[model samples]
Target: ATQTVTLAVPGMTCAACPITVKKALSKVEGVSKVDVGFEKREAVVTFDDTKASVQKLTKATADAGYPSSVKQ
Candidate 1:
């Protein structure tokens, strides 16, 4: 199944944060699109659920030094 999620990335504090976050999410296996909002401090991602999961997405951000959680 295909899935889309909005993640809260409160740790993004600089202009370059979005770039890093986008790069990290893009590297995930099933991620097809990654939109990072610097002002909103959020990431909207589209991916294949069979190849990726919310856990993997969050881990990717965390590994890049920007911890995140699925927006409620």
Candidate 2:
């Protein structure tokens, strides 16, 4: 099944930050789509649960230079 997760990013200060975040998440094996908002400092990603996890997505965000926390 596919799941959607939204993460809150605190370090996104520029428009480019969202792009970077999106690209990184897109590289994940199961990521289907990524929508990032610089103004909201949020990223909504859709991925296959069988192929990915929250931890992996968080790590990808960190690797992209913008660490994130899942919105609870």
Candidate 3:
């Protein structure tokens, strides 16, 4: 099944930060869509459960130099 998650990104201190975050999420194997907002400092991503999850998405951002976590 496909699932969606919102990641809290506190490292976004610039307008271009959301772009960087979007790039990382879109590169994930199962990610189908990604929308990151600079104002919200969060990323919304949709992915296939079999290919990705909260952990995978979080790691993608981490590797890209932006630490993120699941949002409530």
> Tell me, what's the RMSD of every candidate?
2.4, 2.6, 2.4
Ranking under TM-score, best-scoring first?
1, 3, 2
Q: After TM-score superposition, what is the CA distance of residue 10 in candidate 2 from its true location, in Å? A: 3.2
> What digit string (tens of lDDT, one per residue) describes model 3 on residues 1-72?
564667566556765666566656667767787776666578776665677766676687788776556554
lDDT of 2 by residue, 3-31 (tens): 46765665677656765666555566567
- Among these predictions, the greatest TM-score belongs to 1
Stretches off by above 4 angstroms in model 1 are none
* Stretches of candidate 2 exceeding 4 Å from the true structure: none
The C-alpha lDDT values of all candidates are: 0.66, 0.65, 0.66
Considering TM-score, which of the candidate structures 2 and 3 is the better prediction for this target? 3
TM-score per candidate, chains pooled: 0.68, 0.66, 0.67
How well does candidate 2 match the true structure, expressed as C-alpha RMSD?
A: 2.6
- Candidate 1 TM-score versus the reference: 0.68
lDDT of 1 at 49: 61
Which residue pairs of candidate 2 clash?
none
lDDT per residue (tens digit) for residues 1-72 in model 1: 564666566556765665566655656766787776666577776665678876786687788776556654
